Nucleic acid binder design. Sequence first.
DNA 1: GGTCGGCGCCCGAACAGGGACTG
DNA 2: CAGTCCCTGTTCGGGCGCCG
Lengths: 555, 411
Amino acid sequence: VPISPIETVPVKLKPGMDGPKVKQWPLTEEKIKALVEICTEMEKEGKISKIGPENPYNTPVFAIKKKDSTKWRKLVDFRELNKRTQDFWEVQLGIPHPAGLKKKKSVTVLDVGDAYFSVPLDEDFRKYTAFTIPSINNETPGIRYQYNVLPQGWKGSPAIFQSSMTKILEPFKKQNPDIVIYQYMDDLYVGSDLEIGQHRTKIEELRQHLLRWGLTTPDKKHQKEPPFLWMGYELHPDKWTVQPIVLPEKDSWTVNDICKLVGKLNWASQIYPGIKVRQLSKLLRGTKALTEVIPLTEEAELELAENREILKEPVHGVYYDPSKDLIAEIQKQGQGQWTYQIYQEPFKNLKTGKYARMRGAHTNDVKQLTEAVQKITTESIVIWGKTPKFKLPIQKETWETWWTEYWQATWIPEWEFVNTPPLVKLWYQLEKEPIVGAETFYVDGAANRETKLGKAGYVTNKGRQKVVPLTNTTNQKTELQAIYLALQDSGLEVNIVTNSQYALGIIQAQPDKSESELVNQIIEQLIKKEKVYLAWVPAHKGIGGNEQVDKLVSA
Amino acid sequence: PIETVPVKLKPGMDGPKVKQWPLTEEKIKALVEICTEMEKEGKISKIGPENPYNTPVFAIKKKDSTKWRKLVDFRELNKRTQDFWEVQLGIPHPAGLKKKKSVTVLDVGDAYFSVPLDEDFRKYTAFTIPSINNETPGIRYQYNVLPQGWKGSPAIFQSSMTKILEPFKKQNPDIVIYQYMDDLYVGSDLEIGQHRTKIEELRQHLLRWGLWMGYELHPDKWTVQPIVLPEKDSWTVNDIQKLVGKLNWASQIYPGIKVRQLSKLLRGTKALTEVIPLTEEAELELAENREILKEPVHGVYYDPSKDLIAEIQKQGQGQWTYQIYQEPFKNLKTGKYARMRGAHTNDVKQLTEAVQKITTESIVIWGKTPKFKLPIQKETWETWWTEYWQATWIPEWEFVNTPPLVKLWYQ
DNA sequence: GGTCGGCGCCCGAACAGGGACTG
DNA sequence: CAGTCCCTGTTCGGGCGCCG
């Protein structure tokens, strides 16, 4: 067998494990013809070689139909081999995005034919890559081959090709530094600011530099005229957009159809602004069978109709201009939902997106806004390598009030206030010093770990008192209940003294939303107040009325 | 032509496999240049995907330094090689270094490139350079010499280092030299003038063997932050309640603290703003507790076999308090930082500066880096902390969320 | 079809660790 | 007292989308 022009990548098995000897699936007669036709052809071109009984290994094989063609593709079920093969460190750290592309005078796109079959495999490993071809008769022994290139379906092939490909492009990239070559697997975006005459020359210089190593650049896949089709987009000299997205129009929706719908909606959210999937993902909570039919909710059909109307109109993104600043602007779409757009000139979006992750049982709009800023910051440095300037619907004073007093560290990069309702604000402020002339409530609450019963109430400096029997409760739920009672029964200004660390912590974090209805009720009473002062005193120390009300709510 | 020191991982562990995090443009361009140059000087060489190990990498600029510096997050590698640089080739810790009037730090990382690394150990020094928008897949390298930021490098180079320092240690015996990571700590009681002079004597003494920095410390002027009680002449119900809670909380440190009398002043269900006269028995329990806060804690001493642990609290208005301990409530050192870079405008820059100052103090006093309990969300820290980092080492950390309870460390 | 790798999101279930009370 | 439990936050296992 001849030697491939490309260097081979040494591969080992994991120590102490032998190759796979697994048998073969029974195959339909229509796929047996497609395999023996492909096996005898790849054997002619030096890509698979026969093996005798000295090879004790075996692995299954099958063949699926290629999309929009009569040719078949050969795949190997290497699930047992992949287990015992060494681990690789994948080099594809992410997916390129068109928003990171700079406007280039000339652009060329090409795609190499049978990329995995132009790159060799390590000699030693080939012996492991053994499989049997079943004949049309179940009695025929069958044809046993062993691979010599990268088998499609093996876990090392993508990691090996990308590193081998980059090593071949380095000499051309070293001689042609101003040539931008976006290299994602087998696809080469080649752009340059050279004149269109000197550009086609460099195109052929590389198509020959690639040809020297066994990499064919067919003129069928060659692309010289805009619009180019690259990574599932459409690149025009001034604008880009995604290739058309097709949502299902089922009359009866299953869980998998929502998954396929939610998936394409998330994919559409990178340029199509304002896509919401809150009410559609609520269909996926607590469900067990994909194959289970689910009826759409009124809030879900409305969200789908709005998303369909957005996909009707055409949208397009622009390219990255390094000379002008990067800008990102956020809106509060819905409760727990956020959207953003990244641009450099107004309305000329580089890309859009959404953030909706609910972190914690207790949160507010300021926290969620801070979490979205970070999600955008990371995504930005990926695509462009810088942090965009931020237009945020929060008052500069509102934010200054928050981060200066909050006990965690928190920060937002260079930003500016944009007056786009709904504005993010703090719905209440806890006073720092006790209010002069305000009734003082000493609250407490306890329960029994067995009876799940408890009391909760208060005693005031004016003699006011209440104790309320509670059922199905915990020590935490009672201490929160005691604070809810003091707020209900106090004026616009109130001083409240509790001994629960658990409660004070939830509240000093000034939350505006919560998964617990009791917390949500506490919030609503806090907003109705003009001044509120919380304070903590240790329990069981005989403190004020906190020992006279620890004894009334004891049982 | 130098023989390599054979190294091995601690038994029963695999190398680091940590993903690389996204990097800015000004850092990637800085790494590509340094890596292409280091490759040309044979210090590194490209590798492939057969190596299953990886370690994150980024770049920094030290304080008042125009030049970029390559930094590798070998924390996961160092945890998996701990037996080597502690059992076989450890470095003693001069307990007098913390007592010098001035201590200067010198980046000596360039000297490690002179020594080759063990061939079988180069597999674990693997890292990856990312590309903006993932234009190209990851450009991978591995180290051919002693890497900067690895805890095995100053152990292998120690024998070579001691021989370089002997002509200077003999001329100047009263000077104390300690080596930690890529840094060299030199302390002397000399006046600030002739101190900086002897530094340049050693800088030229190091240039003639194949090696520059300048950061000055004053460990004798390091103060501790005690727990203090206010000196009010008129006390209210609320003042006495905050006083008891803080005194109740501090009782876990000083067991002699008692709050009974004060509690007795909080018998009635009184309004918070109501002025309360201090009884005669109360004014004495307040003065004795103030004196117990003057005394040192009983039974607090440093254990070399225990990990250092640090806690940091945000006090607002540019104030940050910290405590360093090995066993809870047995604080080896406490303190407070104020008016650092980024005050009143950037919490993360302040927290980053504080971790550095604290870690530097931990190296001078015990020769260990503490594990940090950081008062910040995990996602907020992992986003911004590299932009304000200005040191060649990286401590370990974790993320907490303890709401304030009763301002124990700052008035 | 029931092959691989990369990246994103959504969910629940499992892990984990700190605070208060009791055995 | 260690041992629960009440609570909350993180990690990870499993679905689709996209790219080749």
